Ligand binder design. Structure first.
Ligand SMILES: Nc1ncnc2c1ncn2[C@@H]1O[C@H](COP(=O)(O)OP(=O)(O)O)[C@@H](O)[C@H]1O
Ligand SMILES: Nc1ncnc2c1ncn2[C@@H]1O[C@H](COP(=O)(O)O)[C@@H](O)[C@H]1O
Lengths: 71, 304, 104
């Protein structure tokens, strides 16, 4: 009975996948896009305040909730 | 006149029906600084914000312009006596300073409840914002308002199965307030205006001249504009001068007469996209106000 | 509120990133499963409301130097009762960032 051998892919997951399923890194919104739903967005932190944000579906209605939260 | 077409429409439509396809919603954790919180309302172009309590893990209340108004009155007076607490207060600590024994539980409504239930709720609780919360998610979807609701009504009801009461005047139906009209003069200081806001719990003040004729309107929203300044000090100025710092809107300009029919008034309010009309006489002398709440109260109690 | 950024960005070693989020996850008493070396499904019990909440974390490359941590809420399946799926997602994300991660 001979020793058996192992071929490991290894570099299948050499590095994290490249970004865009066309998911937008940055969204500018100064005073839709279809599936950035349920994903977390944030503003730059100012004076110890976090602003988190996402868009969710209820039936056919979409709300973008923004939370203002201290740290 | 009618067991209204209005009544029937309101009973057969869900709150969900009024929600826009897309909307934004601002939420504050009750441990947020009030000064930061109100600055955020302005930044986002929003008039009201649900309040989330982290320890309890639930919505507990609402932070509106009226609150911003109560807070600023207390700040101005306290300062004159060397008490500088409030601006470093957290929403919690101020909600602890006001509510005390006087209970104010958050009132909300399901997306599946009727529009009639929604109009009843606003009227009964003497309120301008009604959060629509999904009972399955616990999510706030949208904030319902009189202005929204009236627009929806005007839009989706046919004109001509028309109740007799639509052809009757504000006088005969007795809609609006015609006594003790809270008002300011051209030269009235902003801090006096605030005082009136706090006492009469009214959302806008007509600006009058020496004969008592309407020249402008001064509003509570005109107050969250005192959140653009990173100083807060400017309070001693005349109401006129403060309305120069104005950007847009316009009201005040919106007058009506005691003898216009309900139909004409509804059309004017909805079209101009305004919150109230200043009832006036032959010579522009103010006689009363007719606001969106007046009208919704009228339509829910079947004309009258 | 002008500029909105997707997730958070880091120039740390990817493996150091994944290993640390896993350390924060376990310290916070969440459950999790490793789908990929860069993709996690985490699940939490609400200590107050006893409801369950699920989210996904995925690591992406943006530069040859830079990576981005993505957070996705996973969908389930008169006075307000306690709980909100949307807020609780934000709090989850917040807890995870604070406990795995420091500002530069
Ligand atoms: N749905 C609600 N449940 C409980 N309290 C509310 C609700 N909406 C508003 N309030 C509170 O009642 C007061 C009246 O505000 P309101 O007149 O409804 O809005 P605005 O001040 O924007 O006109 C405020 O102190 C506000 O925080
Ligand atoms: N300046 C004012 N003076 C007296 N009453 C008012 C004034 N503005 C509004 N009202 C009345 O107060 C109620 C609520 O007003 P509003 O804030 O406009 O919804 C309505 O019945 C109005 O007619």
């Amino acid at each position: 009975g001979q020793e058996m051998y192992a071929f490991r892919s290894e570099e299948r997951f050499k590095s994290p996948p490249i970004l865009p399923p066309h998911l937008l890194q940055v969204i500018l919104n100064k005073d839709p896009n279809h599936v950035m739903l349920n994903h977390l967005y944030a503003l730059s932190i100012k004076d110890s305040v976090m602003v988190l944000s996402a868009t969710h579906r209820y039936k056919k209605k979409y709300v973008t909730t923004l939370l203002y939260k201290p740290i | 006149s009618n067991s209204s077409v209005y009544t029937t429409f309101m009973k057969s439509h869900r709150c969900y029906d009024l929600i826009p396809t897309s909307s934004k919603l601002v939420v504050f954790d009750t441990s947020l600084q009030v000064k930061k919180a109100f600055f955020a309302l302005v930044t986002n172009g929003v008039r009201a914000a649900p309040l989330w309590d982290s320890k309890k893990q639930s919505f507990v209340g609402m932070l509106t312009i009226t609150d911003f108004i109560n807070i600023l009155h207390r700040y101005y007076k306290s300062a004159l006596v060397q008490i500088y607490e409030l601006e470093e207060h957290k929403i919690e600590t101020w909600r602890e300073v006001y509510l005390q024994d006087s209970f104010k539980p958050l009132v909300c409504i399901s997306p599946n409840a009727s529009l009639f239930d929604a109009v009843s709720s606003l009227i009964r609780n003497k309120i301008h914002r009604l959060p629509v919360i999904d009972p399955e998610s616990g999510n706030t979807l949208y904030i319902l308002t009189h202005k929204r609701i009236l627009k929806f009504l005007k839009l989706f009801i046919t004109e001509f199965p028309k109740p007799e009461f639509m052809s009757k005047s504000l006088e005969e139906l007795q809609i609006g307030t015609y006594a003790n009209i809270a008002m300011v003069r051209t030269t009235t200081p902003v801090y006096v205006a605030l005082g009136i806001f706090v006492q009469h719990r009214v959302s806008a003040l007509p600006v009058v001249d020496e004969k008592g004729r309407v020249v402008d309107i001064y509003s509570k929203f005109d107050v969250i504009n005192l959140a653009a300044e990173k100083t807060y000090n400017n309070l001693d100025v005349s109401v006129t001068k403060a309305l120069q710092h104005r950007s847009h809107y316009f009201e005040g300009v919106l007058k009506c007469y005691l003898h216009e029919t309900l139909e004409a008034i509804i059309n004017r309010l909805v079209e101009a996209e305004v919150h109230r009309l200043v009832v006036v006489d032959e010579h522009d002398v103010v006689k009363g106000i007719v606001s969106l709440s007046d009208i919704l109260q009228a339509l829910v109690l079947t004309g009258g | 509120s002008m500029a909105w950024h997707l997730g958070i960005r880091s120039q740390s070693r990817p493996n150091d990133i994944m290993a640390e989020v896993c350390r924060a996850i376990k310290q916070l008493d969440y459950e999790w499963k490793v789908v990929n070396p860069y993709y996690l499904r985490v699940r939490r019990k609400n200590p107050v409301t006893s409801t369950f909440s699920k989210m996904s974390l995925q690591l992406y490359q943006v530069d040859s130097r830079t990576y981005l941590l993505d957070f996705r809420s996973i969908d389930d399946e008169v006075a307000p009762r306690p709980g909100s799926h949307t807020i609780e997602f934000f709090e989850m994300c917040a807890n995870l960032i604070k406990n795995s991660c420091t500002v530069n």
